[PDB]
């Protein structure tokens, strides 16, 4: 649930207020913890032109490809990296789709923990 402290600003350098920004997920993403089906949500710029989104990183089969639609209706593609910290929009805006997080170790490691359970079942209780 990384924040996104993105801020928009008019050409005159004043901010936009109560203007709709749309954020859309493309691939139904999921992790061992939970599942994140394809959903979209909007936000309104504050009186000062800031806007915040709480988003999930990309750990699914396909990257949890996010798109931001701005008031001009341009579509900006991007891919939330992993971590826990408020993010500025532009930094991920310039960064398109990337290789997201390490390859599978967690599920097979859970299987291997089950194998360890079996190992403990070999002799002892």
């Amino acid at each position: 649930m990384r924040r996104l402290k993105g801020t928009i600003r008019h050409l005159d350098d004043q901010p936009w207020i109560n203007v709709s920004l749309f954020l859309t997920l493309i691939n139904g993403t999921f992790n061992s913890a939970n599942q994140y089906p394809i959903d979209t949500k909007h936000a309104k710029t504050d009186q000062n032109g800031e806007f915040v989104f709480n988003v999930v990183p990309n750990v699914g089969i396909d990257q949890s490809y996010y798109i931001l639609t701005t008031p001009d209706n341009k579509k900006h593609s991007f891919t939330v990296p992993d971590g826990t910290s408020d993010i500025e929009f532009s930094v991920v805006r310039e960064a398109g789709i990337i290789a997201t997080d390490p390859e599978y170790t967690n599920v097979l490691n859970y299987l291997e923990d089950y194998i360890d359970d079996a190992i403990a079942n070999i002799q002892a209780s």
Binding site: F22, T24, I26, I38, D39, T40, H42, T69, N73
Partner: protein, 132 residues
């Protein structure tokens, strides 16, 4: 490129039955002229079953498609039976009738009275609260 058009383009296999996105609610209000504040309107969303939501979204997609086709077809009608193809001169009337049918279906799914809206004028039920 209508916003909801792309939003639905994402949903390639059918359409979801989760809720009505604020854009979808706004478009419905537009189609039947019910400002979202009206309790008589919002209560309709409450207790709205799933298949009902799917039907709403289908009807909205149809409204968008027919409306776009309306603007597209105007450049036609210049002629009649170009070589052997006579065309329905009422085609525009046909799509108008289809659009009003769609908005009436919308209003009926929510059990609400279709009021003066952008597609129907002076042929509607109950107006503001009890007007008609």
């Amino acid at each position: 490129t209508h916003p909801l058009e792309s939003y639905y383009n994402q949903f390639l296999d059918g359409l979801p039955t989760s809720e009505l996105e604020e854009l979808e609610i706004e478009f419905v209000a537009m189609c039947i002229g019910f400002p979202r504040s009206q309790n008589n309107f919002v209560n309709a969303l409450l207790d709205l079953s799933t298949i009902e939501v799917y039907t709403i979204r289908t009807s909205v997609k149809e409204i968008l498609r027919l409306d776009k086709l309306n603007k597209e077809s105007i450049e036609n009608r210049q002629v009649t039976k170009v070589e052997d193809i006579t065309m329905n001169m009422n085609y525009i009337g046909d799509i108008k009738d289809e659009l009003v049918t769609e908005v009436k279906k919308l209003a009926r799914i929510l059990k609400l009275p279709v009021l003066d809206n952008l597609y129907v004028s002076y042929d509607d039920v109950e107006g503001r609260i009890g007007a008609n």
